[PDB]
Each structure stands twice: as C-alpha cells, then as structure tokens.
C-alpha cells in the first residue's frame, strides 16, 4: 500500500510540474501582454 | 446591433491615440509668429518714433 501510494504521490508530482509548466506559459503570456502595454504608453508618452 | 454578440475585443486592445482632442481648425505655429511679431512690434513701440 505504501508503494502504491508513493506511487501516486510521483505521478501527483509529475502533474504538478505540468501544472507549474502551464501557470509559467500563462506568466509569459501576461509578460506579453505587459510589454505590449507598455510600448503603448510608451507612445502615449512620446505623444505627451 | 452588430452581428448577434458583441464584436470580439483583444485582450489589451488599449490603442491610446487620442493625438487631437476636438479644436484643430486653427493652427497655433502661424498665430505663434503672429504673437511673436506682437511683442517685437510692442518693443519697437517702446523705441522713439517720429520726432
């Protein structure tokens, strides 16, 4: 019981680092989207 | 309204912009010389004429 619940446990930890590999594509994402945003207001203030 | 939904919308979608805000019409650089000639033609005032 203990070997399968080890078991388990690696398996839960392999779908956290998969998890985790998400959450990071997500951060890179919003790190997108914040670089975008702040060329615009770079432009804005340029403009300014 | 347009289609059946709201049109979609980027994520950020800011595009700022807004360079002019109404007025335009007049130019302010002719009327820029145009006040740069009044304070040159008031100090010419101040220096004698005639006489």
Same mark, same amino acid.
């Given at each position: 019981?203990? !070997?399968?619940?080890?078991?388990?446990?690696?398996?839960?930890?392999?779908?956290?680092?998969?998890?985790?590999?998400?959450?990071?594509? !997500?951060?890179?994402?919003?790190?997108?989207?914040? !670089?975008?945003?702040?060329?615009?207001?770079?432009?804005? !203030?340029?403009?300014? | 309204?347009?289609?059946?939904?709201?049109?979609?919308?980027?994520?950020?979608?800011?595009?700022?912009?807004?360079?002019?805000?109404?007025?335009?019409?007049? /130019? /302010?650089?002719?009327?820029?010389?145009?006040?740069?000639?009044?304070?040159?033609?008031?100090?010419?005032?101040?220096?004698?004429?005639?006489?």
């Amino acid at each position: 019981q203990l !070997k399968e619940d080890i078991n388990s446990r690696q398996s839960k930890i392999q779908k956290y680092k998969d998890d985790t590999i998400y959450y990071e594509d !997500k951060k890179k994402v919003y790190l997108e989207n914040i !670089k975008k945003i702040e060329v615009n207001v770079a432009a804005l !203030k340029e403009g300014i | 309204d347009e289609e059946i939904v709201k049109t979609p919308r980027k994520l950020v979608n800011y595009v700022p912009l807004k360079i002019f805000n109404l007025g335009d019409s007049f /130019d /302010d650089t002719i009327t820029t010389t145009v006040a740069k000639l009044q304070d040159l033609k008031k100090e010419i005032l101040d220096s004698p004429r005639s006489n």
